[PDB]
Design a protein around this ligand. Structure first.
Ligand code: 7NS
Length: 568
């Protein structure tokens, strides 16, 4: 699973190019802004499209979670006299670099970045807050991956946050005396959102008009931020891009896995929460993150647990508790059910798993009965119960198109298991607990290899057709693999469309505007509870409202809950 020497060298070359471009697009125009915690100094930067924006990076929203603060809820940062230099980014959270294979980052990572094309707008502006994905184990707010260069064409304030990843963000212990209930990384997000609420006006933002959005684990995070009581009314729109909290990969009960991690790292002693914590508290952070890949058992991997540490139901209550119940239970009471909401997925999500399939062809044989993809809550432990075989058959008829299952059948199935089916479950649960504010659906169906992002390397997608999970990021954010596209190019037009639609929705709670090219004939209605078939804006070279192509398969997955409706 090591990225090729060829791509490692391409990547090293691109990292160097990025350093020089970043320098070249820096200006001498520094500015100072006020915050609750003291003055911050930022700087204007340029874009390759000859735009410019004010950039503040490395604004702390919490105390560095180091030493005794490791694995704990974030605390408010210490204020400062004088001016804090925010003209440079800070480290990303400790994580494995997927190109190099080496551990990178720092425990000192609780920062956010703020961007706008005008620090003194004549009216206060929509504030968009992006939470990055990466399975809660990788990711950053560095502009080599999430550059604001496209968004700042619009009159908005854009904020990109970091939050703790991996075991450092998501360790969880049952022992109440130890104050490690879990979800430290989601609590990081909460404290970032509180900072934004109370400070965005200083950068020209409207604190009464905040939109939180994210993709993949960032979408699950956004959803968590819409579910938890901790954030009630902190913001006003939400966009879930290819994920939510009901996704099987987006939460896990990981309380037993701390001991395993400790033991991988050399711990000698018994499985006792306090002894385990003390060992983990002294370990080098890079040693723990490097070994995180080894934590899951054969059984857990088989049963489709994707990450050893992630969002979890906390075993006891604390003042900072974010997830006191399972996400489905949390939907039934969520304040965020009553704010304008947009959700979507790409047209071939499962293509994302091309790399894993290449290395483990045997996975395709799982579709012979499909029992491993039956939702874990329904399946028996060995996945041999006659009921489990029955449910797996429903899945098999949904995705296997011939006598022998194919790799494409596998990836199609993945689209539904990991993304479309959780979306369906969320929409149906939400309809029974909402003021009635609208939810809009999109389907991202624009395929190009003329402009890409780094995930395409991770998924072995060079020369591969189809719109994978993460392919839409390319049209939202600058990354170091990008380039200036001709303004009449289909790629450039898609950048304008995506940032336009998101800015339009952020502003009004309605993603339609006849000011967007190609939307002239679009009648984009939100989903109603009585709808048997979901309507979505399909985003390709043309913008077209269609019934969701995935609907039939979605209903087939739902039928597995025929005799278990209370679990749907
Ligand atoms: B999104 O943050 C996301 C979803 C899935 Br499913 C899997 C990942 N990974 C797996 C390998 C690294 C990130 C991310």
């Amino acid at each position: 699973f090591n990225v090729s020497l060829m791509e490692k060298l391409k990547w090293k070359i691109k990292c160097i190019e990025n350093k020089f471009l970043n320098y070249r697009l820096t200006t001498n125009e520094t500015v100072v802004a006020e915050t609750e915690y003291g003055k911050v100094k930022g700087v204007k930067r340029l874009t390759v499209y000859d735009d410019s924006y004010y950039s503040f990076e490395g604004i702390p929203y919490a105390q560095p979670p180091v030493g005794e603060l490791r694995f704990k809820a974030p605390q408010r940062p210490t204020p400062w006299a004088g001016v804090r230099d925010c003209c440079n980014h800070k480290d990303k959270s400790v994580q494995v670099d997927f190109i190099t294979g080496k551990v990178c980052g720092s425990e000192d990572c609780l920062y956010l970045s703020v961007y706008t094309n005008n620090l003194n707008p004549e009216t206060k502006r929509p504030v968009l807050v992006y939470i990055h994905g990466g399975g809660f184990i990788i990711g950053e707010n560095h502009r080599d991956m999430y550059g604001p260069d496209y968004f700042i064409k619009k009159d908005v304030v854009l904020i990109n946050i970091q939050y703790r990843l991996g075991a450092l963000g998501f360790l969880s212990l049952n022992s109440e005396d130890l104050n490690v209930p879990g979800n430290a990384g989601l609590k990081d997000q909460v404290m970032a959102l509180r900072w934004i609420k109370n400070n965005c006006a200083n950068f020209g933002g409207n604190p009464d008009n905040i939109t939180v959005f994210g993709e993949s684990a960032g979408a699950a995070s956004t959803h968590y931020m819409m579910l938890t009581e901790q954030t009630r009314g902190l913001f006003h729109r939400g966009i879930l891009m290819s994920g939510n909290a009901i996704c099987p990969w987006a939460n896990t009960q990981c309380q037993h896995r701390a001991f395993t991690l400790a033991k991988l790292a050399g711990y000698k002693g018994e499985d006792n929460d306090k002894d385990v914590l003390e060992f983990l508290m002294k370990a080098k952070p890079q040693d723990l993150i490097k070994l995180e890949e080894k934590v899951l058992t054969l059984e857990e991997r088989t049963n489709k647990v994707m990450f050893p540490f992630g969002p979890t139901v906390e075993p006891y209550q604390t003042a900072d508790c974010v997830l006191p119940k399972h996400p489905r239970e949390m939907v039934k009471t969520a304040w965020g059910n009553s704010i304008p909401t947009m959700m979507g997925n790409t047209s071939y999500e499962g293509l994302f798993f091309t790399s894993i399939l290449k290395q483990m062809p045997l996975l395709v044989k799982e579709l012979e009965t499909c029992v491993n993809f039956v939702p874990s809550e329904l399946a028996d432990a060995e996945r041999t119960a006659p009921e489990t075989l029955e449910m797996g058959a429903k899945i098999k008829k949904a995705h296997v198109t011939g006598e022998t299952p194919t790799a494409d059948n596998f990836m199609d199935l993945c689209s539904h298991f990991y993304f479309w089916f959780p979306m369906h479950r969320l929409l149906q649960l939400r309809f029974n607990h909402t003021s009635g504010t609208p939810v809009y659906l999109y389907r991202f169906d624009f395929d190009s290899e003329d402009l890409i992002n780094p995930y395409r390397i991770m998924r072995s997608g060079r020369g591969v057709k189809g719109v994978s999970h993460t392919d839409e990021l390319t049209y939202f954010f600058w990354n170091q693999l990008a380039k200036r596209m001709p303004k009449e190019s289909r790629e450039y037009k898609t950048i304008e469309r995506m940032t336009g639609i998101w800015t339009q929705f952020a502003t009004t709670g309605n993603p339609y505007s006849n000011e967007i090219e190609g939307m002239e004939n679009v009648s984009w209605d939100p989903i109603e509870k009585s709808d048997e078939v979901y309507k979505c804006l399909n985003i390709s070279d043309e913008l077209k409202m269609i019934d969701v192509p995935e609907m039939g398969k979605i209903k087939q997955w739902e039928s597995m809950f025929e005799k278990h409706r209370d679990l749907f």
